[PDB]
Amino acid sequence: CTGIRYSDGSGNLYLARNLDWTSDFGERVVVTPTGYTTKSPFGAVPAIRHAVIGMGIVQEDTPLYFDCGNDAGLAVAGLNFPGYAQYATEAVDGATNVAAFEFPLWVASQFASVDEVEAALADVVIVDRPINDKYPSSLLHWIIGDSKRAIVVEYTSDGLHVFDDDVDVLANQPGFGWHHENLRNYLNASPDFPEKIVLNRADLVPFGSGSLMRGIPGDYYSPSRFVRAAYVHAHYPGKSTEEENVSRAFHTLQQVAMVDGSAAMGSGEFEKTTYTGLFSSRTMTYYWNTYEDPAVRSVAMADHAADGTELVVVLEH
Amino acid sequence: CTGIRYSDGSGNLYLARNLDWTSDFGERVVVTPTGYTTKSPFGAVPAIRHAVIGMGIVQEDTPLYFDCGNDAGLAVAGLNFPGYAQYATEAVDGATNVAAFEFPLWVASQFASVDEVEAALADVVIVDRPINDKYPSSLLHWIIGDSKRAIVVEYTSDGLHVFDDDVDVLANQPGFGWHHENLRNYLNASPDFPEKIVLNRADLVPFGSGSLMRGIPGDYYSPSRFVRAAYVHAHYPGKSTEEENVSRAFHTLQQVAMVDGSAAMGSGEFEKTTYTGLFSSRTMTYYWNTYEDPAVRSVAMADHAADGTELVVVLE
Ligand SMILES: [Mg+2]
Ligand SMILES: [Mg+2]
Ligand SMILES: [Mg+2]
Ligand SMILES: [Mg+2]
């Protein structure tokens, strides 16, 4: 998984991610309306304050989101983090106890800005409370963004960590602090087309574009995708239309996507980008494509009963 | 530009490329039927022996292809090669003089296999004869493929060279022999997942997939794209359906595509993958998408008169 957050300079939020996995994820577009009766194990989600749309599944009449945004311009994506994610085993009195499966629902249904979430995170404990026996708690970390900025949330063996994500990207393991320091290993990567370079007495000119981009890794390893996404995302010029900003998400994430054959897991199956999803607050719309079809599909929250009482598993797009 | 050639193990050819440029290229899907009256400046294309379909433009009622395939399972793509391409300044008496703009037309309209074009290339001189004053000869090199194999044609200051493209990919500068030798700098790149590596006394386990793919470069530089394409293309599992082989082309080329902001040209403008096109001999169809829209569009040759008499510029 790799995720990005950006804006259009006019207060609109774009948050997008690749879902990387070895097989079909079973993902569906799920709308959570304001009238839905919540099922929050520790009361962290007592009611839906903001309607939510995103990719996930429904179990026990509960939306299990992989990524989602709400009707107030805040979005969140949960990216794989096994070996580093380690949730609390029990709720803590007086804390905001959030089941791991409901954390993105908590972010999106409760708050309207990163400022609000970050303040609420001061007392948050994320608890290993599986939705049921079929689905243990996914081991994840999260990127949360509004039109202004992004934060990263990592709950590990020594507790809750919240980071200022000043590169607006996230990948997988290891922790965000490690990736951020790792950026300092690529200080000579640049899109610039250099003036002619004389090495000793050799006149060296570029073959073409990208001569100073050398060093940006192209492998599928999580630290490499973080660096490659951080570079591409930082240098992508800002856009002011919905169409160009949708195109920016899918192009940026194709730069860090995974295709068949190039990197196996321990099972021998190849990890692939199974879907790429984007939430746009400007149009209150979730866009996506899949490994099998690059055409962009979309579901608008305005097309569904966002003030209804039941979770909507969207079939039409 | 980056191009690839592959098959499905059933005799069907797939040849696809990214076109990388700083602005809109104006490209259209052009069908050249067998009844079209040619305009070959030195007679290298006296008639259309095989109908042709691909991406290009039309000038002076002449199809100027960027890439194309024919009704016999042979395809060709011209990729940018400035600084290394150098054509003959004039036609050579007694040779097969092919104008640079018509070389892909010559390949696709005349021959039915790589064997045939390779035999014919022994007498070929490629000439800097522009189509008109508005379009100088594009400086290019070509990948040519059928279901069996690919060759690379480079016409430089040393004349015509034909290479066995045993990695089935092509990028831009420098020459193919340089890139092929450069592949030997990445011998430890592998998709394999190692369970654990002991370094001194440290137990090292991968963070996840791709730990042995480290070293594959991710930058937009032409040699880097050659290496990156060679790796991805070599390791993509062979597929037997049209749908999966179409998907293979666009996923493989998205791995070496260029997006806005990441690599500037001398002008300061950013080089981007303006379109990605694929020729499929199985369905005699040209597929493509664009920087502005990733949805795959397609034109089937069967929907047009492959034995008509006029160039067809496809719209809608
Ligand atoms: Mg799927
Ligand atoms: Mg509290
Ligand atoms: Mg275009
Ligand atoms: Mg992995």
| CA–CA min distance A3, chain B (Å) | 17
Q: What is the resolution of this structure in A?
A: 2.0
Task: Please indicate whether, in this complex, the C-beta atoms of A295 and B296 are within 8 angstroms of each other.
Answer: yes
Task: Please indicate whether, in this complex, the C-beta atoms of B271 and A221 are within 8 angstroms of each other.
Answer: no
* Contact by Cβ (8 Å): B215, A219: yes
Strands (E), A131-237: 140-145, 150-156, 159-164, 169-170, 197-199, 202-204
- Tokens for B34? 């067998």
Give the Cα separation of B95 and A91 in Å (integer). Answer: 84
Compute chain A's Rg from CA coordinates: 20
A185 inside domain = no
**Residue given tokens 């369970």 in the structure block:** B195
**Residue given tokens 């239309």 in the structure block:** A241
Q: What technique determined this structure?
A: X-ray
Q: Which of residues 73-102 of A touch B (CB under 8 A)?
A: 80, 83
B60: left (phi over 0), alpha (psi -120 to 50) or beta: left
Q: Would an 8 Å CB–CB cutoff place A192 in contact with chain B?
A: yes
**DSSP 3-state of A190:** coil
- Tokens for A265? 């897991």
Give the Cα separation of A60 and A38 in Å (integer). Answer: 11
* Contact by Cβ (8 Å): B277, B19: yes
Measured from the Cβ of residue B61, the count of other Cβ atoms closer than 10 Å reads: 11
* Contact by Cβ (8 Å): B55, B61: no
Task: Please indicate whether, in this complex, the C-beta atoms of B219 and A210 are within 8 angstroms of each other.
Answer: yes
Task: Please indicate whether, in this complex, the C-beta atoms of A255 and B259 are within 8 angstroms of each other.
Answer: yes
Residue to mutate among B18, B239, B252, B259, with most A CBs inside 10 A, is: B259
Give the Cα separation of A259 and A312 in Å (integer). Answer: 31
Compute chain B's Rg from CA coordinates: 20
**Residue given tokens 């979430």 in the structure block:** A117
A208 inside domain = no
Contacts of B233 in chain A (CB under 8 A): none
Give the Cα separation of A139 and A136 in Å (integer). Answer: 9
Task: Please indicate whether, in this complex, the C-beta atoms of A237 and B261 are within 8 angstroms of each other.
Answer: yes
Residue to mutate among A84, A260, A275, with most B CBs inside 10 A, is: A260
* 3-state SS record for B22-90: CCCCCCEEEEECCCCCCCCCCCCCCCCCCCEEEEEEEECCEEEEEEEEECCCCEEEEEECCCCCCCECC
Calculate the CA A146 to chain-centre distance. Answer: 12
* B189: closest chain A residue by CA: A219
Full domain range(s) for residue A150: 2-173+239-313
Q: Which of B273, B246, B277 is nearest to B262 (CA)?
A: B273
Asked if residue A174 has a cis previous peptide bond (ω within 30° of 0), the answer is yes
Task: Please indicate whether, in this complex, the C-beta atoms of B191 and A270 are within 8 angstroms of each other.
Answer: yes
Task: Please indicate whether, in this complex, the C-beta atoms of B217 and A222 are within 8 angstroms of each other.
Answer: no
Q: What strands lie across the sheet with B150-156, from one edge to the other?
A: B159-164, B150-156, B140-145, B75-80, B62-70, B52-59, B28-32, B312-314
- Tokens for B189? 């790149």
A81 inside domain = yes
- List Cα–Cα distances, A313 to A18, A316, A317, in angstroms: 21, 10, 11
- List Cα–Cα distances, A57 to A1, A92, A108, B301, in angstroms: 18, 28, 16, 42
Breaks (C-N over 2.5 A) in chain B follow: none
Instruction: Select the residue of B206, B218, B254 nearest A257 (Cβ to Cβ).
Output: B254
A195 inside domain = no
Burial class for A4, CB neighbours closer than 10 Å (0-12, 13-18, 19+): buried
- List Cα–Cα distances, B218 to A189, B30, B231, B254, in angstroms: 11, 33, 12, 12
Q: Could you give the dihedral angle defined by the CA atoms of residues B91, B51, B141 and B256, in that order, rounded to the nearest 10 degrees? A: 170
B300 inside domain = yes
* 3-state SS record for chain B: CEEEEEECCCCCEEEEEEEEECCCCCCEEEEECCCCCCCCCCCCCCCCCCCEEEEEEEECCEEEEEEEEECCCCEEEEEECCCCCCCECCCCCCCEEEEHHHHHHHHHHHCCCHHHHHHHHHHEEEECCCCCCCCCCCCEEEEEECCCCEEEEEEECCEEEEEECCCCEECCCCCHHHHHHHHHHCCCCCCCCCCCEEECCEEECCCCCCCCCCCCECCCCHHHHHHHHHHHHHHCCCCCCHHHHHHHHHHHHHCCCCCCCCCECCCCCECEEEEEEEEECCCCEEEEEECCCCCCEEEEHHHCCCCCCCCEEECC
* Contact by Cβ (8 Å): B222, A226: no
Give the Cα separation of B147 and B109 in Å (integer). Answer: 17
* Contact by Cβ (8 Å): A90, A69: no
**DSSP 3-state of A285:** strand
- Tokens for A231? 């570079």
Q: Which of B100, B113, B66 is nearest to B279 (CA)?
A: B66
Asked if residue B174 has a cis previous peptide bond (ω within 30° of 0), the answer is yes
Known catalytic residue at A1: yes
Give the Cα separation of B245 and B259 in Å (integer). Answer: 24
Instruction: Select the residue of A20, A224, A235 nearest B262 (Cβ to Cβ).
Output: A235
Contacts of A243 in chain B (CB under 8 A): 292
- Tell me whether strands B124-127 and B96-99 are parallel, antiparallel or unpaired: parallel
Question: Residue A222 C-alpha to ligand 4 middle, in angstroms?
Answer: 7
B184 inside domain = no
- B/e letters for B173-203, b = 16+ CB within 10 Å, e = fewer, are bbbbeebbeebeebeebbbebeeeeeeeeee
* Contact by Cβ (8 Å): A5, A286: no
Contacts of B172 in chain A (CB under 8 A): 207-208
- B/e letters for A70-107, b = 16+ CB within 10 Å, e = fewer, are bbbbbbbbbbbbeebbbbbeebeeebbbbbbbbbbbbb
Q: Would an 8 Å CB–CB cutoff place B211 in contact with chain A?
A: yes
The CA angle A165-A171-A177, to the nearest 5 degrees, is: 50
Give B234's contacts (C-beta < 8 A, 6+ positions apart): B167, B168
Contacts of B296 in chain A (CB under 8 A): 293-295
Give the Cα separation of B12 and B310 in Å (integer). Answer: 28
- CATH number for the domain that contains residue B159: 3.60.60.10
Contacts of B291 in chain A (CB under 8 A): 247, 251
Give the Cα separation of B238 and B169 in Å (integer). Answer: 16
Give A184's contacts (C-beta < 8 A, 6+ positions apart): none
* Contact by Cβ (8 Å): B230, B3: no
- Tokens for A176? 């965000």
- B/e letters for B130-161, b = 16+ CB within 10 Å, e = fewer, are bbeeeeebbbbbbbbbbbebbbbbbbbeeebe
Task: Please indicate whether, in this complex, the C-beta atoms of A83 and B207 are within 8 angstroms of each other.
Answer: yes
B65 inside domain = yes
Inter-axis angle of helices B222-235 and B242-254, to 10 degrees? 150
Question: Residue B302 C-alpha to ligand 4 middle, in angstroms?
Answer: 44
- Tokens for A45? 């989600």
Question: Residue B24 C-alpha to ligand 3 middle, in angstroms?
Answer: 5
Q: Which of residues 249-308 of A touch B (CB under 8 A)?
A: 250-252, 254-255, 257-266, 268, 270-271, 289, 291-296
* Contact by Cβ (8 Å): A113, A120: no
Question: Residue A94 C-alpha to ligand 2 middle, in angstroms?
Answer: 5
The CA angle A62-A18-A98, to the nearest 5 degrees, is: 35
Indicate the helix (H) or strand (E) that contains A253.
helix A242-254
Question: Residue B280 C-alpha to ligand 4 middle, in angstroms?
Answer: 33
* A223: closest chain B residue by CA: B207
Domains in chain B, number: 1
* B262: closest chain A residue by CA: A191
Contacts of A232 in chain B (CB under 8 A): 259, 261-262
End-to-end CA distance of chain B: 25
B303 inside domain = yes
* B236: closest chain A residue by CA: A261
